[PDB]
Amino acid sequence: DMHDFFVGLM
């Protein structure tokens, strides 16, 4: 999901 893009920010 596009929201997963945040997990990659971590």
Side-chain angles (χ1 to χ4, degrees):
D1 0 83
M2 205 140 189
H3 206 71
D4 228 70
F5 86 126
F6 231 132
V7 169
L9 203 147
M10 242 222 253

XYZ file of all heavy atoms in Angstrom:
83
model
N 0.840 -1.185 0.000
C 0.000 0.000 0.000
C 0.885 1.248 0.000
O 2.028 1.203 0.454
C -0.885 0.048 1.247
C -0.700 -1.121 2.216
O 0.219 -1.122 3.049
O -1.560 -2.075 2.092
N 0.324 2.333 -0.514
C 1.048 3.591 -0.579
C 1.407 4.090 0.822
O 2.331 4.885 0.984
C 0.190 4.639 -1.290
C 1.061 5.731 -1.913
S 0.412 6.194 -3.509
C 1.735 7.244 -4.089
N 0.655 3.604 1.799
C 0.882 3.991 3.181
C 2.129 3.283 3.715
O 2.756 3.752 4.663
C -0.362 3.722 4.031
C -0.480 4.612 5.245
N -0.785 5.960 5.159
C -0.332 4.335 6.573
C -0.816 6.460 6.386
N -0.534 5.452 7.260
N 2.452 2.164 3.082
C 3.613 1.387 3.480
C 4.881 2.205 3.227
O 5.917 1.957 3.841
C 3.714 0.093 2.669
C 3.960 -1.170 3.496
O 2.963 -1.549 4.222
O 5.048 -1.764 3.449
N 4.756 3.164 2.321
C 5.879 4.020 1.978
C 6.456 4.691 3.226
O 7.621 5.089 3.239
C 5.347 5.099 1.033
C 4.751 6.314 1.748
C 5.204 7.563 1.458
C 3.768 6.144 2.672
C 4.651 8.690 2.121
C 3.214 7.271 3.336
C 3.667 8.520 3.046
N 5.616 4.798 4.244
C 6.029 5.414 5.494
C 6.927 4.473 6.300
O 7.892 4.912 6.922
C 4.757 5.696 6.296
C 4.653 7.133 6.813
C 3.504 7.838 6.637
C 5.710 7.703 7.450
C 3.408 9.171 7.118
C 5.614 9.036 7.931
C 4.465 9.742 7.754
N 6.576 3.196 6.262
C 7.339 2.189 6.980
C 8.793 2.221 6.506
O 9.708 1.952 7.282
C 6.685 0.816 6.809
C 7.603 -0.296 7.316
C 5.324 0.766 7.508
N 8.960 2.553 5.234
C 10.287 2.624 4.647
C 11.023 3.886 5.104
O 12.244 3.970 4.998
N 10.246 4.837 5.604
C 10.807 6.089 6.077
C 11.485 5.861 7.431
O 12.367 6.622 7.824
C 9.735 7.181 6.104
C 10.245 8.622 6.047
C 9.260 9.524 5.300
C 10.555 9.149 7.449
N 11.048 4.808 8.105
C 11.600 4.469 9.405
C 12.928 3.722 9.259
O 12.969 2.624 8.707
C 10.605 3.595 10.172
C 10.146 4.287 11.458
S 10.079 3.106 12.794
C 8.311 2.922 12.958
